[PDB]
């Protein structure tokens, strides 16, 4: 869990935490009470607290007077490992040394607050499986807690059971009636996750996973949207709770950090994970490194795969077409304009209609453009220079109407677009991964990919099937940093899936 992130504290509270429990170099992060997307990094230095604003407008986290990042945990990791980079306006170095840990259990996935033993039994009996657990406040003994764990065989009939374990709070510390006394509920839970309790007759109280509360029956998505809309809101809690799981996803991005690739990244610290990056072959032996593009393979796991990538730079257009060729991709989804709010988001990597251009070893002909309301389709022919028999059609679906701020007011445009993309891809035997990009290749790109993954479950299984939006996003975020950036995008995913279901 992301311990240095304190949900539901004020600025004044943050200052006092850092002044009373911190030292110089201690820091924490916190969200705005009013605004999803606004965050503050609070840092103790020279016996005082400095607050630094962070904003997410949908494409990345933007640290004021600092750099752009895919996640707050990648931001924190960066400044803890690169001394001198975070600076005050007058030049003075702001050091992030010591994460100040949140002791408040409220945001933990396993924490259920005021919840009865009867209610906890019902939740575990209906939704739980072997090793599902939760912690709740004791009704009998104020300040105490109860750990409730389901154990059994998952293949009803007494083969499973719920066990309740009392957690005492004695003199500011937590225990289970013996052994170690913990400074927080979190420390206690983490210890008994690693070191399971055993009953008198041998049952191991395995804390395998927090009770799942977010999985739904897809046909009931409207009721879940209603529930998540209740007022801050359910949607915000859910997206934040998911965000608290991002420290499990700090996978190496060593290749993207190499000096030989520094000019190949649109944003210096938004990098592909090494374990999923697209590796480019047959490269120019004269180039110091020719195997790198800022792109990751996204494979759903619980047929069709994706390449999530950034908007091309002038110097990466040739690499982009090498990738498209190598991976046998026949469909590109572009979800940005070239220029938005005065800023270039993607260089034009395609020729004008009816024109032919060479891009290094590759050539692309733009055969025909077809303009719909929300998108333009460009029928491109890609081939290797010298080898006409390598020609294949690449269909570029360019979504034009995504708003400059926030998300579209309805999902119909995105749904229609994604339906055309899906059918084109499905019609081409042996097509490779669908290439998807925006500007940084994480916010909108993540949103379109996750929508597509969830819709495809419904295509296969019908509307009577389980879907789990945050679970799916965590799986995609394990393959490219920070996929799905904002709460507005998260709500839009639910909106798109709901309206897919409603138009069957
Ligand atoms: N602590 C909360 C509280 C406070 C006072 C009173 C009651 C309650 C319940 C409480 C916890 C349980 N609820 C909850 N919401 C969530 N949203 C996203 C996620 S992430 C997820 C989901 C599914 C699978 N895999 C992941 C992964 F970890 F891999 F990302 N998990 C969630 N769990 C509802 C909110």
CB 449 within 8 A of CB 296: no
What tokens were used for 313? Answer: 């730079």
3-state secondary structure of 255: helix
To the question of whether residue 468 is assigned a binding role by annotation, the answer is no
Centroid of ligand 1 to alpha carbon of 211 (angstroms): 8
User: Between helices 234-243 and 487-502, what is the axis angle to 10°?
Assistant: 120
Contacts of 448 (CB under 8 A, 6+ apart): 333, 335, 414, 418, 436
Which of 94, 148, 95, 144 shows the shortest CA–CA distance to 121? 148
Centre a 10 Å sphere on the Cβ of residue 364 and count the other Cβ atoms it contains: 24
Distances, alpha carbon 379 to alpha carbons 284, 318, 324, 369, 487, in Å:
28, 19, 14, 6, 34
Buried residues in 416-428 as b, exposed as e (16+ CB within 10 A):
ebbebbbebbeee
First to last CA, the chain: 39
Cα atoms in the Cβ-side hemisphere of radius 13 Å centred on 305: 16
Nearest Cα to Cα of residue 210 among 267, 324, 155, 131: 131
d(CA 30, CA 124): 32
Classified as helix, coil or strand, 88 is coil
- 417/411 Cα distance (integer angstroms): 10
To the question of whether residue 48 is assigned a binding role by annotation, the answer is no
Domains detected in the chain: 11-99 (3.30.505.10), 111-219 (3.30.505.10), 227-503 (3.90.190.10)
Question: What 3-state class would DSSP assign to 327?
Answer: coil
**How many other C-beta atoms are found inside a 10 Å radius of the C-beta of residue 350?**
22
263 secondary structure, DSSP code? G
Residues with CB under 6 A from ligand 1: 106-109, 111-113, 212-214, 237-238, 241-242, 245, 468, 470-471, 474
Whether 50 contacts 22, CB under 8 Å: no
Give the chain's radius of gyration (CA, Å).
25
452 labelled binding-site residue: no
- Cα atoms found within 13 Å of the Cα of residue 32, Cβ hemisphere only: 12
Q: How far is the CA of 213 from the centre of ligand 1 (A)?
A: 6
291 CA distance to ligand 1 middle (Å): 39
**What's the CA gap between 27 and 95, in Å, rounded?**
9
Q: Is 438 considered catalytic here? A: yes
The three-state (H, E, C) secondary structure of 362-412, written as one string: EEEEEEEEEECCCEEEEEEEEEECCEEEEEEEEEEEEECCCCCCCCCCCCH
Structure solved via: X-ray
The pairing of beta strand 132-137 with beta strand 209-210: parallel
Rounded CA-CA distance 148/132 in Å is 8
Residue with token string 């630094």: 52
CA separation (Å) from 339 to 102, 352, 385, 405? 41, 17, 30, 13
Whose CA is closest to 396, among 383, 375, 421, 377?
Answer: 377
Residue 439 known to bind ligand: yes
Resolution stated for this PDB structure, in Å: 1.8
Q: Are the C-beta atoms of 454 and 467 separated by less than 8 Å?
A: yes
SS3 of residue 216 by DSSP: strand
DSSP H or E segment with residue 476: helix 469-477
Tell me whether strands 61-63 and 48-56 are parallel, antiparallel or unpaired.
antiparallel
Backbone φ and ψ of 165, nearest 5°: -120, 120
Ligand 1 mean position, distance from CA 268 (Å): 32
Give the bridge partners for 499, in sequence order.
none
Q: 176, 183, 179: which is closest to 104 by C-alpha? A: 183
Token look-up 């610290």 returns 269
Q: Which atom of ligand 1 is nearest to the CA of 475?
A: 29
Closest CA to 145 of 101, 182, 196: 182
Which string of b and e fits 45-78 if b means at least 16 CB within 10 Å? beeebbebebebbbbbbbbeebbbbbbbbbbbbb
Q: Coil, helix or strand for 136?
A: strand
Query: 143: burial class by Cβ within 10 Å (0-12, 13-18, 19+)?
Result: exposed
Substitution candidate for ligand 1 out of 116, 228, 242, 454 with most atoms within 8 A of CB = 242
Chain breaks in the chain (C to N over 2.5 A) after: 155, 231, 302
Question: What span, in angstroms and rounded, lies between the C-alpha atoms of 331 and 422?
Answer: 9
Enter the tokens of residue 388.
Answer: 């006409």
- Helix/strand/coil for 112: coil
CB atoms within 10 A of CB 412: 14
Which residues share a beta bridge with 359?
362
């Amino acid at each position: 869990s992301r311990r240095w992130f304190h949900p539901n504290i004020t600025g004044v509270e943050a200052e006092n935490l850092l002044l009373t429990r911190g030292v110089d170099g201690s820091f924490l992060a916190r969200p705005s009470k009013s605004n999803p997307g606004d965050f503050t990094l609070s840092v103790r230095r020279n016996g005082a607290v400095t607050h630094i604003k962070i904003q997410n407008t949908g494409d990345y986290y933007d640290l004021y007077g600092g750099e752009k990042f895919a996640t707050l945990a990648e931001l924190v990791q960066y400044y803890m490992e690169h001394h001198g980079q975070l600076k005050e306006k007058n030049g003075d170095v702001i050091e992030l040394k010591y994460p100040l840990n949140c002791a408040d259990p409220t945001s933990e996935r396993w924490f259920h607050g005021h919840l009865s033993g009867k209610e906890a039994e019902k939740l575990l009996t209906e939704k739980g499986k072997h090793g599902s657990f939760l912690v709740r406040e004791s009704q009998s003994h104020p300040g105490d807690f109860v750990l409730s764990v389901r154990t059994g065989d998952d293949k009803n009939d007494g083969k499973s059971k719920v066990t309740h374990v009392m957690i005492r709070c004695q003199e500011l510390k937590y225990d289970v009636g013996g052994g170690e006394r913990f400074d927080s509920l979190t420390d206690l839970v983490e210890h008994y996750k690693k070191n399971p309790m055993v009953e008198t007759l041998g049952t191991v109280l395995q804390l395998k996973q927090p009770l799942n509360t977010t999985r739904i029956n897809a046909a009931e998505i409207e009721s879940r949207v209603r529930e998540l809309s209740k007022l801050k809101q359910g949607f915000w809690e859910e997206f934040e709770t998911l965000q608290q799981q991002e420290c499990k996803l700090l996978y190496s991005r060593k290749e993207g950090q190499r000096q030989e690739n520094k000019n190949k990244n649109r944003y210096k610290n938004i990098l592909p994970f090494d374990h999923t990056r697209v590796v480019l072959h047959d490269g120019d032996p004269n180039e110091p490194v020719s195997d790198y593009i800022n792109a990751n393979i996204i494979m759903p796991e619980f047929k069709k795969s994706y390449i999530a990538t950034q908007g091309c730079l002038q110097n990466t257009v040739n690499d982009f077409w090498r990738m498209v060729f190598q991976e046998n991709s026949r469909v590109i989804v572009m979800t940005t304009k070239e220029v938005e709010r005065g800023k270039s988001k993607c260089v034009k990597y395609w020729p004008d209609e009816y024109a032919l251009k060479e891009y290094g070893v590759m050539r692309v002909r733009n055969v025909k453009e077809s303009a719909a309301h929300d998108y333009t389709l460009r029928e491109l022919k890609l081939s290797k220079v010298g080898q006409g028999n390598t020609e294949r059609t690449v269909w570029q679906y360019h979504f034009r109407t995504w708003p400059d701020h926030g998300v579209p007011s309805d999902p119909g445009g995105v749904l229609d677009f994604l339906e055309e993309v899906h059918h084109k891809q499905e019609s081409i035997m042996d097509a490779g991964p669908v290439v998807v990009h925006c500007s940084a290749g994480i916010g909108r790109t993540g949103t379109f990919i996750v929508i597509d993954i969830l819709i495809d479950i419904i295509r296969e299984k019908g509307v009577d099937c389980d879907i789990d939006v945050p679970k799916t996003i965590q799986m995609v975020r394990s393959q490219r940093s920070g996929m799905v950036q904002t709460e507005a995008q998260y709500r839009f995913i639910y909106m798109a899936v709901q309206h897919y279901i409603e138009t069957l």
